[PDB]
Chain length 216, copies 3
């Protein structure tokens, strides 16, 4: 309900997740198997994007049949879509960027919103409305680790979730920063793997991603 509460809630969700998979469901029959593969590998928090028609149905199925998993919605481009996912049962909302509307929509919503930003001005726009937890997108192109450090100076009280360009080669560098909650990506969700139903490959890849984070 309170802005400071959503900041804490979204913070709890991201720390327990560690790695936020950006899922795009192309086929209905892929919801559960995909979800079980990730879950077995240690990834219990999912981000289902509205990048496909099956977006909403997926959130619903997962919220009724896999209640143990924490499922959020992504690629919400307007207040209309924001309202939809909220009814579908999403536990949190994620966006690629911000607008005045969306930011106010997250202030009135019951579930927390992790807005996506790229620049200091965009951070301030959400800072003013009480946002303290942001998603950096695209991570690499925006300046990656160097950017996160730069923003830490003027905005020392905000945490980030870099997404876009994050992979096994740079995943620890990001997680090393004290102001990074978790990272997001799709490197364990290879397209070919999903089609051919190679769920053992996905399960193995998720396990590797989680095992990669354990030291600093």
């Amino acid at each position: 309900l309170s802005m400071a509460d959503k900041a804490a809630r979204i913070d709890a969700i991201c720390e327990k997740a560690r790695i936020l998979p950006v899922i795009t469901i192309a086929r209905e029959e892929d919801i559960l198997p995909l979800a079980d593969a990730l879950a077995a590998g240690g990834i219990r928090t999912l981000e289902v994007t509205l990048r496909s028609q099956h977006g909403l149905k997926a959130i619903q199925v997962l919220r009724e049949q896999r209640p143990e998993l924490c499922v959020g919605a992504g690629t919400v481009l307007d207040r209309s879509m924001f309202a939809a996912v909220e009814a579908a049962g999403a536990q949190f909302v994620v966006t690629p960027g911000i607008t005045e509307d969306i930011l106010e929509a997250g202030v009135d919503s019951e579930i927390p919103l992790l807005p996506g930003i790229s620049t200091p001005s965009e951070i301030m726009m959400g800072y003013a409305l009480g946002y303290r937890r942001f998603k950096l997108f695209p991570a690499e192109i925006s300046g990656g680790v160097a950017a996160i450090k730069a923003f830490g100076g003027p905005f020392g009280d905000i945490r980030f979730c870099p997404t876009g360009g994050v992979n096994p080669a740079n995943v620890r560098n990001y997680m090393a920063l004290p102001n990074v909650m978790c990272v997001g990506t799709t490197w364990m969700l290879d397209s070919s793997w999903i089609k051919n139903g190679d769920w053992a490959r996905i399960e193995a890849c998720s396990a590797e991603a989680i095992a990669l984070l354990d030291a600093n």
Copy 2:
């Protein structure tokens, strides 16, 4: 008249153009000769910037004497300038970036507007008002080809026109992407060439730019 119509119109203009030259007229007597040089080289769509006083006069002269060429205006920084170029006869408008005003100005205008963006948040700001065709500026600094690909994920239904840093060495890489309508630049409009009236050099350079695009 309709937003979806302008999206299509601006899309038609950019596909037939392939290469959008960003022109800045420093001398009146350069309008036609410059225009004929480009036109002979295969470049029939021009973007006259308001970066100089001769901006408006150029659009007018070209619209009355070279009706066969498709001429648009660029570097429109406010609703006032937007209104001016529209009266001057510009067939479309281009901007380096976006503001709330400008975006609404393009919704009320009769001629289509290709707004310039750099980040996902900026894309969304125009997406909300019905824009589906954007100009990436500055292309190279914003992430070039990698950026275009990144934006394709969340915004898979929008096309781009990269400008800034585009040259013969990277022009095909951009044109290879399915979500790139055309590219813009000034590499065939060398300053020295214009002054000394070396129109043969410009004509040859335009021909080379068009010939460079033919395979993928």
Copy 3:
């Protein structure tokens, strides 16, 4: 009072400064000694950030005891903070990014504001309200020298103050550009130096920074 006046005033302040040190006071007893060290090295214009509690007190002490120095405030994230620093005695205000509020706050304020921007859209947002002097942040990540040159094309009548990534290795490259007023940084304000009170090291470093700018 007039927008065009603040543009000139802020321009005067930045040219006489050459190098704008971004200060963060961690201890009260560091105000004067730090200020005298910089001043002796040739740096008479300071930017005290509100990144710490001692921000406001510092501006006050410096405005009453070191009236010969030109002191401004930084890291002003809202209209509330903007009003505070103005009462504290700041001679100018600086921000890491922009918002609609802040930009209007600088239009009503008596002291000039140097807003921080990263992209063309952000520049336009402030351009519309009459701003012609901007701070590029983060300089390096935003495109550094190449970015400054790119923005010079469409916005040929604005000057910049790059901050973030500026150091002895690239400081002259920036100062060479005709549309750069000055640069900002913290490379002469090493943390360890401040704690251990190594003011001779700071004084020597400031002198070196000023001596580095003399040729182009």
